[PDB]
């Protein structure tokens, strides 16, 4: 993925959240960009939060994942819009996707021994594995699991 | 050297590839067990501790998949003895037998079998007039290592795993003490004599010498001797195979 964005936003009404997401998508499309995936992780319970528009230190927020393929000139505009949006409490940008983190710190041999195409072609979920997912699931993908997952409740 | 030829031969003659003919499969199992014993005691001879062969002369029979019957006879020399000269010459004898078996299987090539014959003739010439001298393995060494690492008979199930296998049964006709007598002192040190092909047959203990009353199972009375069990399974071998096939 070119760029990833995690948006922590105040859990406003459905119409307001939809309008904010629509504005973000319209800006991304108008700036000559593409959205790989937009997902809503629901309302969670962060350890600490402090709103900026309402100045209320309360722990209630919603998380959203947005994957983009945009150039730097337009990604600057998109980042500015997202950061200046009143609803976006905290936006974090992952730009360390096409290159593994800290290969230079790791070793000089690994500095030029990586292929960016694999990371670019894979989605953000494969780049950063979720706790519930596993390589067991990945191998179950190519094991013809439909014809095998038939006695999973035989006991 | 002979690695590819031995791999092809074991692929052709391995019993695990013949499920349609259980008789052929068990014949191949017995033949490969005898071959493994032959190679083991030949390696013992080569190392230096010499013991009488289990069978000085015997015929080994194998069956080959289409893509006949391969029977090769191993014979020991008349002057065979635990002497060092016969220790050296039995290696050539077993190499000749193995190369004959491979040639009948058609896996080896004419050039490589001629090379083996040349090596045997060279060793025979050298053992007469003493020489001096100061690497690739032989056919026997390649065969033993391939049998150990790649083409080996699956280990026989132990009674501990047979407990959870749902294959060991005993009825109320006999007491738990009798069942324990039938199990503990008759399976720990007496399971080596039992046939490998028999290992897939569920075992029941009951006061009767019958070939089984359930589907695909056989029963043996408690406090039996291993010789008596061997005699019974030699008396009846077709019924157990047919029952396993129909099950």
């Amino acid at each position: 993925v070119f760029y990833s964005f995690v948006l922590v936003m105040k859990p406003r009404q459905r119409r307001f959240t939809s309008q904010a997401l629509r504005e973000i998508g319209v800006a991304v499309y108008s700036n000559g960009g593409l959205i790989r995936s937009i997902t809503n992780e629901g309302i969670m319970r962060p350890y600490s939060r402090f709103r900026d528009a309402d100045n209320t230190p309360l722990t209630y927020a919603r998380y959203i994942i947005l994957q983009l393929d945009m150039g730097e000139e337009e990604m600057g505009k998109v980042d500015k819009i997202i950061r200046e949006h009143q609803d976006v409490l905290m936006a974090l940008k992952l730009n360390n996707l096409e290159r593994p983190v800290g290969i230079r710190s790791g070793n000089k041999e690994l500095q030029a021994a990586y292929f960016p195409l694999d990371t670019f072609t894979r989605l953000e979920e494969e780049i950063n594995w979720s706790p519930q997912t596993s390589a067991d699931i990945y191998t179950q993908l190519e094991m013809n699991w439909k014809e095998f997952s038939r006695t999973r409740w035989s006991s | 050297m002979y690695k590819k030829a031995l791999h092809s031969f074991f692929l052709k003659v391995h019993p695990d590839f013949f499920h349609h003919n259980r008789s052929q499969q068990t014949v191949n199992e017995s033949s490969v067990a005898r071959l493994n014993e032959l190679l083991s005691w030949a390696k013992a001879f080569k190392s230096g501790h010499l013991q009488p062969p289990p069978s000085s002369s015997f015929t080994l029979t194998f069956y080959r998949k289409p893509d006949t019957i391969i029977q090769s006879t191993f014979e020991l020399p008349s002057n065979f003895a635990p002497s060092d000269n016969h220790r050296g010459t039995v290696e050539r004898a077993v190499n000749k037998f193995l190369r004959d078996l491979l040639r009948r299987a058609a896996c080896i090539d004419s050039v490589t079998e001629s090379i083996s014959e040349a090596e045997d003739a060279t060793a025979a010439r050298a053992e007469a007039k003493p020489l001096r001298r100061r690497g690739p393995k032989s056919l026997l060494d390649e065969a033993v290592e391939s049998m150990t690492v790649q083409w080996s008979l699956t280990p026989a199930p132990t009674l501990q795993e047979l407990i959870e296998a749902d294959q060991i049964l005993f009825s109320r006709d006999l007491s738990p003490l009798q069942s324990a007598a039938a199990l503990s002192t008759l399976q720990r040190h007496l399971g080596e004599l039992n046939y490998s092909a028999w290992e897939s047959m569920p075992v029941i203990v009951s006061n009767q010498f019958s070939i089984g009353d359930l589907t695909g199972t056989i029963t043996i009375p408690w406090d039996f001797t291993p010789e008596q069990f061997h005699s019974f399974m030699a008396h009846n071998e077709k019924g157990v195979a047919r029952c396993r096939e129909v099950a």
């Binding site: 319970r45 962060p46 350890y47 722990t59 | -």
Partner: protein, 38 residues
């Protein structure tokens, strides 16, 4: 918020004990956030 983090109760009183190099302080507060005693 979850896991090993303790889950408080509205009846429990939070006592703060702050020791200094040459002083010490003991204060208490209710769950609502009121000073039980100075």
């Amino acid at each position: 918020m979850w896991g090993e983090m303790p889950r408080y109760t509205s009846d429990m009183v939070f006592l703060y004990l702050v020791s200094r190099r040459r002083n010490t302080y003991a204060v208490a507060y209710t769950y609502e956030g009121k000073r039980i005693l100075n």
